[PDB]
Amino acid sequence: SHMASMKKKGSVVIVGRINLSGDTAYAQQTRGEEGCQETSQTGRDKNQVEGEVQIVSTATQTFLATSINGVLWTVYHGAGTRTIASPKGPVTQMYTNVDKDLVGWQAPQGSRSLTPCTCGSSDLYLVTRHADVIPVRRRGDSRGSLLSPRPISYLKGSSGGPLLCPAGHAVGIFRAAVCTRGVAKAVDFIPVESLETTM
Numbered sequence: 001s002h003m004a005s006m007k008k009k010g011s012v013v014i015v016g017r018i019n020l021s022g023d024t025a026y027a028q029q030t031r032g033e034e035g036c037q038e039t040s041q042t043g044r045d046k047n048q049v050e051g052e053v054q055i056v057s058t059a060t061q062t063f064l065a066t067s068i069n070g071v072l073w074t075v076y077h078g079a080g081t082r083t084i085a086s087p088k089g090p091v092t093q094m095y096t097n098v099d100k101d102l103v104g105w106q107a108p109q110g111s112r113s114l115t116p117c118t119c120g121s122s123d124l125y126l127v128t129r130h131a132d133v134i135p136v137r138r139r140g141d142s143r144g145s146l147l148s149p150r151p152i153s154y155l156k157g158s159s160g161g162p163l164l165c166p167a168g169h170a171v172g173i174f175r176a177a178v179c180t181r182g183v184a185k186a187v188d189f190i191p192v193e194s195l196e197t198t199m
């Protein structure tokens with residue numbers, strides 16, 4: 001009831017990336033925890049952004065975000081309604097869909113965007129926050145099975161990351177793990193068509 005002391009949530013902050021530009025996939029950190037905390041409060045991030053897949057953080061969570069068609073997409077359960085930090089101050093979401101667990105902001109200058117897949121192919125690849133590439137067979141509009149199941153620990157923090165086709169197009173955004181006895185045998189993802197409709 002005391003508005004003058006009500007706090008504001010900070011921005012989502014880009015803290016690294018999954019580098020996919022060469023022959024080896026690897027995670028890079030571009031900002032530490034202390035600098036992330038300060039950037040989240042100000043919303044002013046002057047760091048150079050590169051690549052398609054970003055590692056992002058709030059004060060309490062860390063996850064991924066993926067650029068497709070000029071929009072940096074991630075999950076609502078990670079970002080909520082938060083702004084993203086940017087060189088000129090906080091930037092408001094341009095898409096928010098809690099029913100799909102989806103949000104998006106204009107893609108940062110310097111990022112590169114994935115192209116939405118039109119191959120109609122079901123041999124996919126999930127990219128995790130540790131730069132593991134996980135073969136996934138598509139099993140429906142929004143589901144795929146891991147060829148080699150993994151404990152959910154291995155997937156935790158990778159929501160917002162991409163599923164790609166063999167040609168490297170974006171097929172979907174990783175949303176939730178399909179888990180029994182803590183082993184992920186399948187994944188739930190936001191299909192790129194749903195992004196394209198949301199757009």
Ligand SMILES: C=C[C@@H]1C[C@]1(NC(=O)[C@@H]1C[C@@H](Oc2nc3cc(OC)ccc3nc2C)CN1C(=O)[C@@H](NC(=O)OC1CCCC1)C(C)(C)C)C(=O)NS(=O)(=O)C1(C)CC1
Pocket residue numbers: 061062063064076077078098099100101152153155156157158159174175176177178179188
């Ligand atoms: C392990 C890595 C996972 C990718 C990951 N995802 C999650 O943990 C998501 C968030 C939440 O699901 C949702 N929450 C929502 C919340 C909303 O408004 C608040 C609105 C819409 C939402 N829609 C969904 C689906 C639960 N869940 C799951 O996966 C759960 N399995 C599940 O529910 O399966 C069913 C059957 C198959 C379909 C759904 C599980 C039990 C924890 C494994 C991950 O990495 N997250 S994350 O980065 O660590 C981190 C928490 C961000 C930091």
Ligand SMILES: [Zn+2]
Pocket residue numbers: 116117118119120121165166167168169
């Ligand atoms: Zn494709």
